[PDB]
């Protein structure tokens, strides 16, 4: 007559901005957008610390400043923009700035273990990219149908 | 159990006399049942397929 | 408005002549809608399998 058939499909291992493992990790509230929007799997720069009240003013990278952290994905403070997930003009972020996270790639290689990390100059990792940061790659190396994402540990500043 | 690929092949029919080649065989071996599985089409990771009986 | 046969993502398959210049092929068809019934399935994972054509 006819033979049975049966599939099998597996998950993908993980989305752009989320949280990689449960080690140690610390994220900071407190902290609004100064100008611009943000995207999810990108770092952050701080434009100016408040002496009195305590909010940091936070932006995305430019050239030639420091990264501060990542934002992470929430299904409640975030706000749907170009069919991505997106932080807005003012409200409130969520900056980790230290743990394991999967951040946007560029680059087309495979790195190493215990290599530094290279962001270009909108925030996303690059193998060549001209900003240097402390943070130390974890090994993941994944891609998300046509988004390539890499697993990045990083260091309270 | 065999790749659902194979399933093809096994529908073809007797050299001239009618009915599938799969009819035959059940009928000349009766008590074995065929299934297939999608987990037979990459055995080694490179693209061969695999029967098991 | 798109009509039903210029809707960007659907499953295209180009084919050889069922008719050429007046010569007809009719074991080239059944090997197409084959193809194409085993095309639905396999990408669908069994969810939804062809019932017309």
Redesign the interface.
């Known amino acids: 007559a006819q033979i049975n058939a049966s599939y099998q499909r597996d998950m993908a291992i993980a989305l752009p901005g989320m949280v990689a493992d449960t080690s140690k990790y610390n994220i900071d509230g407190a902290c609004v957008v100064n100008e611009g929007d943000v995207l999810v799997g990108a770092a952050v720069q701080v434009v100016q610390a408040q002496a009195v009240d305590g909010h940091k003013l936070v932006k995305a990278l430019t050239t030639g400043t420091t990264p501060y952290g990542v934002a992470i994905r929430s299904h409640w403070q975030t706000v749907n923009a170009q069919n991505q997930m997106i932080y807005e003009d003012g409200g409130a972020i969520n900056v980790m700035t230290s743990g394991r996270v999967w951040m946007l790639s560029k680059s087309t290689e495979a790195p190493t273990f215990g290599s530094a990390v290279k962001l270009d100059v909108d925030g996303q990792e690059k193998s060549d990219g001209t900003i240097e940061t402390t943070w130390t790659y974890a090994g993941g190396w994944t891609k998300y149908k046509d988004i390539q994402l890499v697993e990045v540990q990083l260091h309270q500043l | 159990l065999?790749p659902?690929s194979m399933?093809?092949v096994?529908a073809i029919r007797m050299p001239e006399t009618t009915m599938s080649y799969?009819d035959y065989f059940k009928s000349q071996n009766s008590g074995i049942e065929?299934?297939?599985?999608?987990?037979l089409e990459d055995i080694d990771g490179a693209g061969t397929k695999g029967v098991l009986v | 408005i798109v009509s039903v046969f210029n809707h960007p993502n659907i499953t295209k398959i180009t084919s050889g002549k069922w008719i050429d210049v007046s010569t007809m092929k009719p074991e080239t068809a059944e090997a197409e809608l084959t193809q194409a019934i085993e095309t639905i399935e396999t990408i669908t994972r069994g969810q939804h399998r062809a019932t017309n054509i």
């Open positions: 065999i659902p399933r093809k096994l799969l065929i299934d297939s599985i999608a987990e």
